[PDB]
Amino acid sequence: GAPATVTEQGEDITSKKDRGVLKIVKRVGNGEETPMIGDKVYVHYKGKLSNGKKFDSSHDRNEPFVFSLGKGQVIKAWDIGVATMKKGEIAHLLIKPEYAYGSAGSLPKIPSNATLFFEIELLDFKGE
Numbered sequence: 809g810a811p812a813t814v815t816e817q818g819e820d821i822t823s824k825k826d827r828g829v830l831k832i833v834k835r836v837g838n839g840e841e842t843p844m845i846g847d848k849v850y851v852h853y854k855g856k857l858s859n860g861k862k863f864d865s866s867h868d869r870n871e872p873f874v875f876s877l878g879k880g881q882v883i884k885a886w887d888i889g890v891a892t893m894k895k896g897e898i899a900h901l902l903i904k905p906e907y908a909y910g911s912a913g914s915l916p917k918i919p920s921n922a923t924l925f926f927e928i929e930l931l932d933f934k935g936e
């Protein structure tokens with residue numbers, strides 16, 4: 809499973825090194841530049857529970873998912889994870905609850921203490 813590969817071979821990109829966010833690069837993006845705090849980022853993604861018992865995908869709006877990086881507009885794992893991504897890159901993230909919704913969850917979609925999995929494609933990013 810794509811999740812299993814991230815467990816075994818994913819890099820811990822957390823500052824605390826608690827394996828709360830693990831990452832594999834599935835397709836290399838271009839150049840060296842990755843986005844700074846405050847950059848506008850454009851992604852496609854899809855996501856599911858570590859189980860997969862729930863599943864959701866941006867693509868259904870053929871328009872990109874857009875947010876300002878590093879400003880708390882998304883769960884912590886995304887501010888951490890998307891920051892490490894290059895233009896055109898596709899990555900897998902496996903995320904412990906503490907970097908997502910925690911024990912609060914986000915019912916009824918996301919239960920308490922849920923692990924999440926995402927495939928993210930970084931389409932572009934532009935400066936504050």
Ligand SMILES: C=CC[C@@H](C(=O)N1CCCC[C@H]1C(=O)O[C@H](CCc1ccc(OC)c(OC)c1)c1cccc(OCC(=O)O)c1)c1ccc(Cl)s1
Pocket residue numbers: 853854855856857862863864865874875880881882883884886908909917918924925
């Ligand atoms: C419809 C389900 C939501 C989806 C999900 O978990 N996210 C959507 C993509 C981005 C990551 C993550 C997320 O940050 O959810 C957030 C949920 C709200 C939120 C934001 C910031 C948070 O912490 C700083 C936060 O903490 C619990 C929750 C989200 C959803 C939709 C849009 C958005 O920002 C752009 C905008 O507001 O226009 C942000 C999942 C998909 C599959 C899953 Cl399993 S979980």
